[PDB]
């Protein structure tokens, strides 16, 4: 949802929602930094 509204043209997602995604993906999901790099590549590949 958040990567879909704050999307601009698709995969171009800025750096405030990467780490806002992190504290919710660290809070709701409890994830790291580098596994988070893989899940953000999957999030922009899905968002692509």
């Amino acid at each position: 949802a958040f990567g879909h509204k704050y999307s601009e043209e698709g995969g171009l997602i800025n750096e405030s929602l990467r780490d806002q995604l992190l504290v919710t993906i660290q809070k709701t999901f409890t994830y790291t930094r580098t596994q988070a790099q893989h899940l953000f590549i999957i999030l922009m590949e899905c968002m692509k």
Partner: peptide, 22 residues
């Protein structure tokens, strides 16, 4: 009330990011 809800959602996300900044 709908304005208050959307704005409070934005404020809560900013507060969680502020906690991340600490």
């Amino acid at each position: 009330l709908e304005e208050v809800n959307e704005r409070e959602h934005s404020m809560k996300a900013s507060l969680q990011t502020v906690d991340i900044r600490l």
